[PDB]
Structure 1
Amino acid sequence: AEPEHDQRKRMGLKMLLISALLTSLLYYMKRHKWSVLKSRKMAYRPPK
């Protein structure tokens, strides 16, 4: 019924590893760029 059974699962293995790795790297990059806004501070200094 599914001659590709084994190969399918070997791919799933790599898919999972690459995914873990890639998701983490991209999570960091997203956080890195967004740090600018995330820690940003502001104040309202109206005149006299």
Structure 2
Amino acid sequence: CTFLRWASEPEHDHRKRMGLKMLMMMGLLLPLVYAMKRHKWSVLKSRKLAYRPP
């Protein structure tokens, strides 16, 4: 059964390896890209308005 599984999915080992690298890259990137988004948008998030009609 294990051999037939290899026959159906020869890339199994490399698939899991690339998945590991993918997980680590997203765990490193997604926080950083989110930090960049917060960095750029923080002008608008802290934006304070005021109304001064005559």
What TM-score do you get using the length of structure 1 for normalisation?
0.94
**With CA pairs under 8 Å and 6+ residues apart, which has the higher RCO, 1 or 2?**
2
What TM-score do you get using the length of structure 2 for normalisation?
0.84
Structure 2, unaligned runs of 5 or more: 1-7
Superposition misfits of 4+ residues, deviation over 6 angstroms: none
How far, CA to CA, are the matches of 2:53 and 2:10 in structure 1? Answer: 73
Whose radius of gyration is greater, 1 or 2?
A: 2
> Which structure is higher in helix share?
2
What aligned pairs does 1:1-48 form with structure 2 within 5 A after superposition?
1-47=8-54
How far, CA to CA, are the matches of 1:45 and 1:5 in structure 2? Answer: 66
Structure 1, unaligned runs of 5 or more: none
